């Protein structure tokens, strides 16, 4: 395989949130804008 | 070349279509198809 730069590939953006139990909310001691990626990293195969 | 796992890389979502020349949706055909347009995505070492 080849794999991205940075061994991830697309991610989309996620912010933190804590529990309030079974309700969520926004964790502002989180960014707000961070990039995961779901599942394995991107690859091509040679 | 490097390939995409599943050889094909970016499709568009194609519905199938059939001559009635007039053509219109044929309903025993996906509506919602991943088809290439092309050759495969590529990269090249």
Redesign the interface.
Known sequence: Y?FPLDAVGRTDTYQGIKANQTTWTKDDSVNDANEIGKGNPF????
């Open positions: 080849c690859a091509m195969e040679i």
